[PDB]
DNA polymerase alpha catalytic subunit
Amino acid sequence: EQVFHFYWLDAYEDQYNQPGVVFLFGKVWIESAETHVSCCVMVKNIERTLYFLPREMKIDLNTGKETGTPISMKDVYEEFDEKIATKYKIMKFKSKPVEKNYAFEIPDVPEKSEYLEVKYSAEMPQLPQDLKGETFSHVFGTNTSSLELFLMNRKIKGPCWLEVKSPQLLNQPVSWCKAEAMALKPDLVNVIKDVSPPPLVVMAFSMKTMQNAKNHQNEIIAMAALVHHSFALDKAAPKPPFQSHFCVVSKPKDCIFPYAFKEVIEKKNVKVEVAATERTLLGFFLAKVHKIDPDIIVGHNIYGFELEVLLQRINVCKAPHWSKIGRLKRSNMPKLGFGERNATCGRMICDVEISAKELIRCKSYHLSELVQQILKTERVVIPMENIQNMYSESSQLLYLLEHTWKDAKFILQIMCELNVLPLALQITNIAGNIMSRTLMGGRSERNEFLLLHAFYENNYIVPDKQIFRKKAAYAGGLVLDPKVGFYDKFILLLDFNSLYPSIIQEFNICFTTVQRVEQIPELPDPSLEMGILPREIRKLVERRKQVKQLMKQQDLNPDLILQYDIRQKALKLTANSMYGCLGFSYSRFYAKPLAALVTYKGREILMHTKEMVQKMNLEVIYGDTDSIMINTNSTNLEEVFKLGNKVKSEVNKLYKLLEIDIDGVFKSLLLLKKKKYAALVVEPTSDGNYVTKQELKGLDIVRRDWCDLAKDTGNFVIGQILSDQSRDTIVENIQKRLIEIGENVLNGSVPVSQFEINKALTKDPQDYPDKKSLPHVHVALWINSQGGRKVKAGDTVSYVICQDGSNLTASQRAYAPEQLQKQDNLTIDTQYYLAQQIHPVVARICEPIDGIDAVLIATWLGLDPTQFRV
DNA sequence: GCCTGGAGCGC
DNA sequence: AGGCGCTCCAGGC
Ligand SMILES: Nc1ccn([C@H]2C[C@H](O)[C@@H](COP(=O)(O)OP(=O)(O)OP(=O)(O)O)O2)c(=O)n1
Ligand SMILES: [Co+2]
Ligand SMILES: [Co+2]
Ligand SMILES: [Mg+2]
Ligand SMILES: [Mg+2]
């Protein structure tokens, strides 16, 4: 023959200009150049694929009644061949009778049956999804994407090595990739598995933008990028993260580079190119883009701002070869990340903002916040006003560029820190979806691609793509009534391991085993074998076991362990995510009856577990969906854990796969209400001993809509409660401090910082009808209608309550911090805070404590108690 | 007092 | 472009 190997990373298509074709960009070894180069493979002839559902008896449309002659594959074949094919302009077409299974929303479809498969060019017309005929009642695949068909049929599951049999060269190059080939047909393409993945060429960039003096615009005057041509994903980030780097700067228009700048750059030997203009930077950049030809281009908030502005600034400055951004040669340049992903199609865009939004939690996900919390370092924020100045002296521009060179070094280390790539890879290789799509976030799609591959492989007719917070549509998890109170004696936290994924298998809940048509469907007959969905979850559970069982190995490749830990986490998020999409109204595999059955059993399973743990003379004090809080009443740790391993074993004993576990043990517990509670957690260390760490749940103290001053104050009180000290020593400590907090708010010693209450706007400040009494929206209209920047939906506004001298309600007395200090009439509303922030949280924390209460707390805070109740 | 919805968390 | 469960706080009548 003649075959070649290529590792793909991104797949693209243009169902409108080139139906039937799918472009795949990846990497290829060039033995002569001892290195992987980019590579584009063109796959032609991916034919539509439709299934026609035969009727029991033939029908006649002009009457809408039966005829009497049964149907056969010959019948249908003919009707299409004769009326259908001919009428919709179908020239060539091949068919064949096949047998397919189905288990979905479309009633009047047999679980199994014989369809007439039909394949014809993607170029020919595409039929009406609702078509019907003399011989057939329905027809699927009528709109199946070319990239779907290809991926499903070839059993491709995310990045992996492919074999292209009988490749063709191309005279006219269509991409910007070093290598290019063409595949004559979908089946010349074959997945291979015994091959390690190839390193990647990753480029980390950052940019600076300046608004112009006269005309309104966003001119990019600088750009930094770090580069690694060997950034592996089947192993640990590299040390260093980059191998080479480049800088570029340009004067906006009406400014000159300080003098001696050229010679100060030559002086300190920095790889920085001084660009004479905006176009000269854009063109210098695309030039580099194209030469380093990075598979993965990383940045900060890319699909939101940074990218939109890079492409529009190439449209304005009429830059040379815009697509050199992406990997495909193209002519027109779209605009608004759809229009954007496409501009970079063939290349993967890692956005450290959205990735983190997915791997951890923070108050705000903007770089500075992220660098700090993740790298444990401070990041200098340089305003756009200080910029024009910087250009006055050679030292300042050199700093604004050493600054942009840093961001690109936080982003590549932020990325490098969370293993966002080696993780993304696997989440994909597990669901078989598309990696670039993964890094773009979204669980729902990844689910779909996992069930499709599942259902194809198992000869199922998959549901056609549908071309188009809410009120709960069915019962969910169970919450046990909490036995409010403070606990001194040890508490046992027993919590089920993957309660939903397990429940799905344990009871064989699957599209293919549960009978359905609001009611809770009946569990499948234990006779049936494992449906597909369960069998899927099982592979996950099994492969995961295999890994956590490899981690126990000795004299093993050290770094491997970091890896095994990633796959394992992936093997879990996956599984636990399966449940969700089952209940999502827009998920291709909507199936409400199942999602219901799954939580129906969970409720049941959690109830019994409680009834049991009680028939065991142990008091259950709280339970949330699948967890159990037990009061051991023992102060003897060793004794707890045994009581622990005991309950476990008595429970596990009840299921084939379900398994509960000692999730943990609390030194003391403050249980306020459902979903709200504090706790000292037990973290054993060197045997015979342990150390304690405080864990808060649902407390106002955790939320964002409260001022520090209160959260702090609240925090301390919780701290003293779970504390060791006596009850009287605590009540005292609490009184002592509150008192002090009051007085310190009255003598304005409390940094206005604290009072600063924060909130976010779900709509733009102008979108509100009853705006006036909403302090966060009202303070925003000020800002928006006062200075430059403008607050819009999704943003948080900082305000504080003051004394207007307008006897208006507190709500209507919200001023930006800035405005409180810069004006003299505005004074902080000590009265508000002491009674609308501090006394409402501390009060609730103490509700169960004897010795502290509403009325007492007020008097302490220096408020008028008489106005309060117990 | 009675009865909605967002926020925002928990799982 | 995954569920439902529970405070709480507003708000309209
Ligand atoms: N973000 C979440 C968290 C939980 N759940 C549902 C499905 C879980 O099966 C069940 C229990 O929540 P857990 O926090 O206990 O998650 P798991 O039980 O699945 O894992 P673990 O074995 O660690 O308890 O609640 C969910 O739908 N979405
Ligand atoms: Co409500
Ligand atoms: Co009210
Ligand atoms: Mg659990
Ligand atoms: Mg749980």
